[PDB]
Amino acid sequence: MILDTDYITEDGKPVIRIFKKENGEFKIEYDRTFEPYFYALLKDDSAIEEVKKITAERHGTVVTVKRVEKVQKKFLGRPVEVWKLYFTHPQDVPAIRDKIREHPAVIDIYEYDIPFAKRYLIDKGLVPMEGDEELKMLAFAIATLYHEGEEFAEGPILMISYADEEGARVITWKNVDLPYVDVVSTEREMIKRFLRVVKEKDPDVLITYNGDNFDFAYLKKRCEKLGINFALGRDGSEPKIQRMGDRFAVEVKGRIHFDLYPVIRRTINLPTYTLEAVYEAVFGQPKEKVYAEEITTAWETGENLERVARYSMEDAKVTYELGKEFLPMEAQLSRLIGQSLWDVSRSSTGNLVEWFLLRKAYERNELAPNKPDEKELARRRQSYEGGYVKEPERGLWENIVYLDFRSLYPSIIITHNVSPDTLNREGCKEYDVAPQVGHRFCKDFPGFIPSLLGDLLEERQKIKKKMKATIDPIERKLLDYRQRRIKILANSYYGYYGYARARWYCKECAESVTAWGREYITMTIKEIEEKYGFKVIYSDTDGFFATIPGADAETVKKKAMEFLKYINAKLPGALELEYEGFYKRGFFVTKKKYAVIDEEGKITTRGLEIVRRDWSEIAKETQARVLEALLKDGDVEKAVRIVKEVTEKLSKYEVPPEKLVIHIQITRDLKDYKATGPHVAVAKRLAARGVKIRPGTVISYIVLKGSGRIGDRAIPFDEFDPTKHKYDAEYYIENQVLPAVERILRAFGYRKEDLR
DNA sequence: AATTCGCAGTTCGCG
DNA sequence: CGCGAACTGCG
């Protein structure tokens, strides 16, 4: 199993290291034969010996073109000849590429920004995380001494906890009377003991929660103050702290540093991403938070350190359990994309698609288009029309079916062969023409993307077959993760086409996909209404809700099935309309906001305040209770009574403050805000006290009694003191609870004033 | 740093 | 000074 690749330099030459786990044994394979390269398109082929002779400077060393070679490649499906330029060292490419490009005899250069170690995985056809290897995992966490106003890591680390399959332990340098606590005499001894634990356990994976931006940088700065060689890497190196623009990321050579924090933020939608909230959401069990003020207080007084150590132990324990839950899924992502788990677990959609495509392009001798520079990025600013959204027939409906297309956009891409290499390609026998926008797509050969998509969807079906047939629980589950990752990847191609930073950006492809989607859904709506007598209540992009106004539940179901047989005989290629479900009742509030109830009483909500982090729990819970009384009991009277009891509890200050918290993400640097809403106001005051506020921070605040601007009486919920602060009961009535329920209960004649 | 589609709370500036 | 537009966030 390949874990990662990198390179080191030996006598001026790159040596690739392949880090592997084979038969339970860690191995480093060295490859001295791989040459960095990129491609150049020349106006005339005699110009090569001119550019073959260009040189650059790399702090000290002159940089030469090592050697050149003419190759035949495809570019967007058309044959092309280019010069492959080889170099001695990968750092030669950034030093020289701008000067080779600026040459008047060079039309353009290509594949000039591919990191050497990732280039190696692609060109050698190596796929990380393949095979039957069990990885040894170890989670760790730290507790630090924090004082408001101090610089980062001016205080000592107080405890280091770690956990694996054998249990969890805490190292600390004060006496704590617990069996899982190991006491050493100093902070230096604690770090050194932790280093020895990691060396002795020799894990393949180090799991942290936000270790990229807290734990390792804290450890590093203490190790600098204390004179510790923090040799965590299997090659004896220190953790390598890389700038990723906004934040940092930390590598441990020969291991996989698996930071759960970027993984969870991209995998689950939670109102906040504290370790306690993530653990409770994933496993359903509570985890108690101990705050920095309490930790520092316990350390300086020497009292109740057992509580701090138990919290520290539990941090490591739940980090391990979360690592066990999420690492297998990320390993399948790594195998599918063909890049290291470290990389893919820190990457966004656009990057992941692009790395998959670069590997496929290499496999097919397709030269990669370049990323856009500034002038092209501005040229790609234009938007295009998206999915069709019908204004709902608002209100309460009975006996509804939902019909939707199976994977509408992937079906369109495959059926109509939508790809930048087939777009208006001249000379073909056959074309499909996008409605409205008119783009033509050659059908004579499978386009690059449709071909990859079709392979993906076919592989996913084969995995589902192997899953049901396989006789192995571990294999069955890894297959499940793989088919889920394939679905996400296949569903990512449409948006990637419209992504202005994409190498294979194609706005014509993107808007042809949406145009066909609009044509299929609106034509299907027309057929069901005109030929089958349905009333379409609401429709959004790839599906619609419909009923037969005067009909009973069984009539609606059966005629829906008849329509499906009718319409699917008319739909071309991979387009397929499917029966998604029957809902006894549904309430449609606005576009993209509705709730339905199935025959077993399960309520599904979409777009409603109940799902949003920026609405208080008291409002969300009231909306939920109103929707239960309407959809399940058909009892408007009960729903109104519910609202009146909630508004009465608020005005008597009987609601727990925890149900009044509003969670809102900070999305940018605080000085970049043109306007200051309440969460920005809270964040700015926290940053004034020295608190680290970065994009992605979730501000959790409560609105206090007073008047004027909400932001002027908003405070972090952590600071809420029910003895010195009064929450704004009227604010949570008038701005939270009543707005969330009013738009539902208006359909039955009630105004806000009859609910207070 | 996937897309376009959508709703709505807060703040503020304008007649 | 009530109203709407801008800003903002998150489905």
How is A364-406 classified by DSSP, letter by letter? TTBPPPPPP-HHHHHHTT-------BPPP--EEEEEEEEEEET
With CA of A680 and C1' of each nucleotide, the nearest comes out as C8
Q: Same structural domain for residues A107 and A214? A: no
A160 and A117 in a common domain: no
Is the C-beta atom of A389 closer than 7 angstroms to strand C? no
Give the Cα separation of A306 and A395 in Å (integer).
Answer: 56
* Residues A119 and A148 occupy one common structural domain: no
Judge whether A383 and A372 are in contact, CB under 8 Å: no
Q: For residue A397, what are its two tokens?
A: 């409906």
Tokens for A606? 């979409």
Tell me the C-alpha distance between A188 and A169, whole Å. 18
Output Rg (C-alpha) for chain A, integer angstroms. 30
How far is CA A4 from each of CA A21, A52, A342, A504, rounded to the nearest angstrom?
Answer: 10, 33, 8, 27
Please name the residues in contact with A155: beta carbons below 8 A apart, sequence gap of 6 or more: A144, A145, A146, A147, A296
Residues 6+ apart with CB under 8 A from A62: A55, A56
CB A43 within 8 A of CB A168: no
Interatomic CA distance for residues A174 and A512, integer angstroms: 66
Report the b/e string of A34-48 with b at 16+ CB within 10 A. Answer: bbbbbbbebeeeebb
- CA neighbours closer than 13 Å in the CB half-sphere of residue A453: 25
Distance A500 CA to B4 C1' (A): 14
Rounded Cα–Cα distance for residues A263 and A139 (Å): 15
Same-domain pairing of A308 and A171: yes
Q: Is A251 in the same domain as A205?
A: yes
Taking the C-alpha atoms of residue A141 and residue A319, their distance in angstroms, rounded to an integer, is 8
Contact A159, A172 (CB under 8 A): yes
Which strands make up the sheet holding A714-716, listed edge to edge? A662-665, A698-703, A714-716
* Residue A241, domain CATH: 3.30.420.10
- List residues with CB under 7 Å of strand B: A 245, 347-351, 383-387, 389, 492, 494-496, 498-501, 510, 514, 589-593, 675-678, 681, 709-712, 735, 739, 743
Q: How far, in whole angstroms, is CA A491 from its chain's centroid?
A: 14
- Strand C–CB A495 distance below 7 A: no
Task: Compute the 3-state secondary structure of chain A and give helix, strand, coil in percent, each to the nearest 5.
Answer: 45, 25, 35
d(CA A403, CA A539): 9
Distance between the alpha carbon (CA) of A379 and the C1' atom of C6, Å: 26
**Intra-chain end-to-end CA distance of chain A, in Å:** 64
Experimentally, the structure was elucidated by X-ray
Which sign, positive or negative, has the C-alpha torsion A338, A316, A664, A755? Answer: positive
Residues A283, A539: Cα–Cα separation, whole Å:
35
Q: Hey, what amino acid is at A78?
A: R
User: How far, in Å, CA of A240 to CA of A217, rounded?
Assistant: 10
Give the residue ranges of DSSP H helices in A470-577: 473-490, 493-497, 507-532, 553-570
A72, exposed or middle or buried, with CB in 10 Å at 0-12, 13-18, 19+?
exposed
Closest CA to A557 of A695, A402, A679, A423: A402
Q: Which helix (H) or strand (E) holds A546?
A: strand A543-547
Q: Hey, what are A162's tokens?
A: 């770690």
A661 touches strand C (CB under 7 A): no
Q: Do both A335 and A193 map to the same domain? A: yes
Q: Which residue is nearest to nucleotide B10 (CA to C1')?
A: A677
Q: How far apart are CA A304 and CA A177, in angstroms?
A: 10
Tokens of A350: 């656009």
Separation of A499 CA and B4 C1' (Å): 12
Q: Which nucleotides of B are covered by protein (CB under 7 A)?
A: 1-12
| Cβ-proximal residues to A69 (8 Å cutoff; 6+ apart), any chain | A83, A84, A86
CA distance A557 to A638: 30
d(CA A556, CA A547): 6
- Pick the closest to residue A261 from A327, A333, A315, A210 (CA basis): A210
> Residues A155, A365: contact at Cβ < 8 Å?
no
Residue A564 sits at φ, ψ, to 5 deg, of -60, -45
The secondary element (H helix, E strand) that includes residue A686 is helix A678-688
Q: How far is the CA of A714 from the C1' of B7 (A)?
A: 24
Helix (H, G, I), strand (E, B) or coil at A744: helix
Q: What is the CB neighbour count within 10 angstroms for residue A414?
A: 23
Q: How many helices (H) and strands (E) does chain A have?
A: 24, 28
Q: Three-class SS of residue A71?
A: strand
Best CA proximity match to A439, nearest among A542, A499, A513: A513
Q: Which sign, positive or negative, has the C-alpha torsion A623, A625, A631, A637?
A: negative
Three-state DSSP state, A472: coil
Q: At how many degrees (to 10) do helices A216-226 and A187-201 cross?
A: 120
- Cα A124 to Cα A34: distance, rounded to the nearest angstrom: 10
Q: A187: which 2 tokens?
A: 């902070």
Reported resolution, Å: 2.0
Q: Which domain holds residue A145?
A: 137-345
Same structural domain, A108 and A212 = no
Shared domain for A257 and A313, answered yes or no, is yes
Give strand C nucleotides closer than 7 A to any protein Cβ.
Answer: 6-11
- CA distance to A34, A48, A92, A497, per residue, from A38 (Å): 13, 14, 11, 25
List the structure tokens of A718.
Answer: 């952590």
DSSP codes joined into one string, A411-426: HHHHHTT--TTTBT-T
How far from A21 is each of A1, A130, A206, CA to CA, in Å?
5, 10, 15
Nearest to A162 by CA among A143, A146, A189: A143
Q: How many Cα atoms occupy the beta-carbon half-sphere of A28 within 13 Å?
A: 15
Residue nearest to nucleotide C11 (CA to C1'): A607
Q: Note whether A94 and A175 are same-domain residues.
A: no
Q: Check whether residue A608 and residue A651 sit in a common domain.
A: yes
CA-CA distances (angstroms) from residue A137 to A129, A205, A218, A231, A321? 15, 5, 22, 18, 10
Burial of A71 (0-12, 13-18, 19+ CB in 10 A): middle
Does one domain contain both A114 and A172?
Answer: no
- Residue whose C-alpha is closest to residue A494's, from A524, A525, A517, A523: A517
The CA–CA distances, whole Å, from A201 to A141, A162, A195, A198 equal 16, 11, 10, 5
* A665 CB less than 7 Å from any atom of strand C: yes
Q: Rounded CA gap, A461 and A478, in Å?
A: 15
* C-alpha span between A489 and A470 (Å, rounded): 24
User: Which of the nucleotides lies closest to A606 (Cα–C1')?
Assistant: C11
What is the spatial distance between Cα A358 and Cα A1, in angstroms, rounded to a whole number?
A: 22
Nearest Cα neighbor of A705 from A663, A657, A637 is A657
Helix (H) or strand (E) holding A291: none
Backbone angles phi, psi at A27, to 5 degrees: -140, 140
Tell me if A86 sits within 8 A of A69, measured CB to CB.
yes
Distances (CA, A) of A364 to A340, A447, A585: 22, 12, 52
The separation between CA A683 and the C-alpha centre of its own chain, rounded to angstroms, equals 24
Q: What is the CATH number of the domain that holds A116?
A: 3.30.342.10
Tokens 């005989």 correspond to what residue?
Answer: A569
Q: Clarify whether residues A220 and A99 are in a common domain.
A: no
Query: Rounded to whole angstroms, how far apart are CA atoms A223 and A191?
Result: 8
CA A210 to chain centre: 15
> Which candidate, A344, A147, A324, A382, places its Cα nearest to that of A263?
A344
For residues A466 and A488, give the distance between their C-alpha atoms in angstroms, rounded to a whole number: 19
Determine contact, residues A172/A181, Cβ cutoff 8 Å: yes
Tell me, what CATH number does A653's domain have? Answer: 1.10.132.60
